[PDB]
Amino acid sequence: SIIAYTMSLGAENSCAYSNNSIAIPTNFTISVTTEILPVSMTKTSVDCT
Amino acid sequence: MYICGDSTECSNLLLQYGSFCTQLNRALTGIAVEQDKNTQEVFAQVKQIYKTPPIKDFGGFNFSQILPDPSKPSKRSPIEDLLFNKVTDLICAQKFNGLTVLPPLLTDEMIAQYTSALLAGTICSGWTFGAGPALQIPFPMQMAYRFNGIGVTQNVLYENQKLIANQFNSAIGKIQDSLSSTPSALGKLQDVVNQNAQALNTLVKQLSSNFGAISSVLNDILSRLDPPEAEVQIDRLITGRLQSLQTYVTQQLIRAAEIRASANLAATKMSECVLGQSKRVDFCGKGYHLMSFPQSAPHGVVFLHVTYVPAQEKNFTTAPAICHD
Amino acid sequence: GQSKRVDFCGKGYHLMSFPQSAPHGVVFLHVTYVPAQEKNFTTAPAICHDGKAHFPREGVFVSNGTHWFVTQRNFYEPQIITTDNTFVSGNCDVVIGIVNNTVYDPLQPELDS
Amino acid sequence: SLSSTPSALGKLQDVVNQNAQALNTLVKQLSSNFGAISSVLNDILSRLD
Numbered sequence A: 001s002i003i004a005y006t007m008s009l010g011a012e013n014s015c016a017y018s019n020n021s022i023a024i025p026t027n028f029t030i031s032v033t034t035e036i037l038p039v040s041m042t043k044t045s046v047d048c049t
Numbered sequence B: 001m002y003i004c005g006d007s008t009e010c011s012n013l014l015l016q017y018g019s020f021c022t023q024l025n026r027a028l029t030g031i032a033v034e035q036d037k038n039t040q041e042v043f044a045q046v047k048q049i050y051k052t053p054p055i056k057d058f059g060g061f062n063f064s065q066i067l068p069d070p071s072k073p074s075k076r077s078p079i080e081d082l083l084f085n086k087v088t089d090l091i092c093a094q095k096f097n098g099l100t101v102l103p104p105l106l107t108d109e110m111i112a113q114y115t116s117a118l119l120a121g122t123i124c125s126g127w128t129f130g131a132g133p134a135l136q137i138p139f140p141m142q143m144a145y146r147f148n149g150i151g152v153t154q155n156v157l158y159e160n161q162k163l164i165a166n167q168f169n170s171a172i173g174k175i176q177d178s179l180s181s182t183p184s185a186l187g188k189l190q191d192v193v194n195q196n197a198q199a200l201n202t203l204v205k206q207l208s209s210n211f212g213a214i215s216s217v218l219n220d221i222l223s224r225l226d227p228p229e230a231e232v233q234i235d236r237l238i239t240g241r242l243q244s245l246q247t248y249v250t251q252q253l254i255r256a257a258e259i260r261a262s263a264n265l266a267a268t269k270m271s272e273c274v275l276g277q278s279k280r281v282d283f284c285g286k287g288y289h290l291m292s293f294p295q296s297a298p299h300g301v302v303f304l305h306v307t308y309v310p311a312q313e314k315n316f317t318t319a320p321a322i323c324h325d
Numbered sequence C: 001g002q003s004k005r006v007d008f009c010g011k012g013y014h015l016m017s018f019p020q021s022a023p024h025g026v027v028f029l030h031v032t033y034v035p036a037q038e039k040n041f042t043t044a045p046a047i048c049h050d051g052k053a054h055f056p057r058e059g060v061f062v063s064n065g066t067h068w069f070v071t072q073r074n075f076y077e078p079q080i081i082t083t084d085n086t087f088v089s090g091n092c093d094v095v096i097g098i099v100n101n102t103v104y105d106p107l108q109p110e111l112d113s
Numbered sequence D: 001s002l003s004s005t006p007s008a009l010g011k012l013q014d015v016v017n018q019n020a021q022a023l024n025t026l027v028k029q030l031s032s033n034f035g036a037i038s039s040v041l042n043d044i045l046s047r048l049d
């Protein structure tokens, strides 16, 4: 059925702000993402007459 | 409804034209869609929502005017509350002539939540949350990194931590007062609103024009004339009204393009100055950029840019190199 | 080139990219890095040694529980705190949260040998 | 990912679709009277002086 709902804005998350506590990475992941952009559009011409 | 105010005869005459109304509807629908997209691109950059920490002492740094006020009906920071109060029956008259306004997809509360999440993210983990997971960093160390980023050793920060926190806290208080007293501070957002209102008022106003017709009112044309004479008079009014709507839409499209450019810029600034640190000159404030904090506003975004400016200076002798042995 | 603009060339830290063509357009493949496993360590802004204050030159002071080391900011590769990893400026009285530790002097064993 | 996601290239597809509509509209707009007796010039000229 069609359901109505309030949208979620994002995942709930958290961090511990804390003085003298720091996180440091121990490993990494390489990822590749794709970005798409248009450059041109069909060139057309209309004869008025 | 704008053109043919519940007149069957007008509608049938309107149908002698091509798909005019369809094109106008497509243009306005397209604009409305873009307006929600712009909002999402500017604010919903981070989909992880962090809570504002309960510890209101970031190594001497305040931020209470920036962070949301938990005691209010709308969880706006003191600064945001001011911005909303400063930027500001005709709506019925417009409604009755077929001119309406659609709600935004995101509400002000939703925007405030995105803004708060970004602020919580930045205060807790600096820029790390914007490029991977959020890594907590003691606030003064986030500042140390930001100092190294502008060519000043971190030694300066630690030695002067109290001074820096005090100058910072004073600067924030000054902004809220500046916005409160300056009547033109939010003129850019007010101008957008004013232009849209004027464009709609113009459409309502032109309904009264005759355009060569005996009268502006279809009901009077129909109550006094026979069919073929009325058709001539009605067609004169239709032509005029079609032109009025077409003019409106063309301008509305041009204004929408301008706004997309503004929104794209705003999105860029957030990505580069809020979720990072920028080396671009005058991109995010005059002076050296350290960090930024977004605030929401009606129809837009307000950024607080924290920068450094060199102060007292002295005249010294210099030389390219030292000759030793 | 390699851009430092955040999210300009994609999410994470930008390394490089490769274009691909497309009908009426361009598609970019952006190679970026994202930090993965991470650990929480205790920290301090400086180390107090001989009464002088030592700051890391290119890193963060990290406490592993009973020992202090220096790591590069983006990766956990602990170094011994030595005089070649720090610089000294100011005394132990000014920096807030400075902790007492040993800074190793690499010359000492040669003086004794 | 590109192979499996049909919406992946929507940004380019949309350019194409919008320009197609712009031309389809011009062609369809030919079949209008605009107050004339017919949409076709040849019929107007064939029957009227």
Ligand SMILES: *[C@@H]1O[C@H](CO)[C@@H](O)[C@H](O)[C@H]1NC(C)=O
Pocket (backbone or CB within 6 Å): A016, A018, A021, B136, C040
């Ligand atoms: C350490 O990190 C874990 C996540 O890996 C988190 O659940 C925990 O609360 C953190 N502890 C502190 C003191 O920040």
Ligand SMILES: *[C@@H]1O[C@H](CO)[C@@H](O)[C@H](O)[C@H]1NC(C)=O
Pocket (backbone or CB within 6 Å): B056, B057, B058, B060, B061, B062, B063, B064
């Ligand atoms: C911020 O300043 C106000 C006074 O303007 C004070 O009442 C409040 O406690 C301060 N908050 C912090 C975190 O320093």
Ligand SMILES: *[C@@H]1O[C@H](CO)[C@@H](O)[C@H](O)[C@H]1NC(C)=O
Pocket (backbone or CB within 6 Å): B315
């Ligand atoms: C120092 O700089 C100022 C300009 O800022 C100049 O007027 C002054 O003469 C200079 N003094 C010396 C000793 O060079």
Ligand SMILES: *[C@@H]1O[C@H](CO)[C@@H](O)[C@H](O)[C@H]1NC(C)=O
Pocket (backbone or CB within 6 Å): C064, C065, C066, C067, C078
């Ligand atoms: C970290 O602490 C443990 C003791 O808990 C010690 O055995 C180990 O050697 C220390 N790490 C390094 C790199 O020295």
Ligand SMILES: *[C@@H]1O[C@H](CO)[C@@H](O)[C@H](O)[C@H]1NC(C)=O
Pocket (backbone or CB within 6 Å): A019, A020, C096, C097
């Ligand atoms: C860190 O937080 C604790 C909270 O108990 C406080 O006692 C301490 O003075 C704070 N500052 C430093 C530098 O440890």
Ligand SMILES: *[C@@H]1O[C@H](CO)[C@@H](O)[C@H](O)[C@H]1NC(C)=O
Pocket (backbone or CB within 6 Å): C048, C098, C099, C100
């Ligand atoms: C560092 O050593 C001095 C020795 O006089 C002592 O007074 C001070 O409390 C020590 N500091 C810490 C953090 O242990």
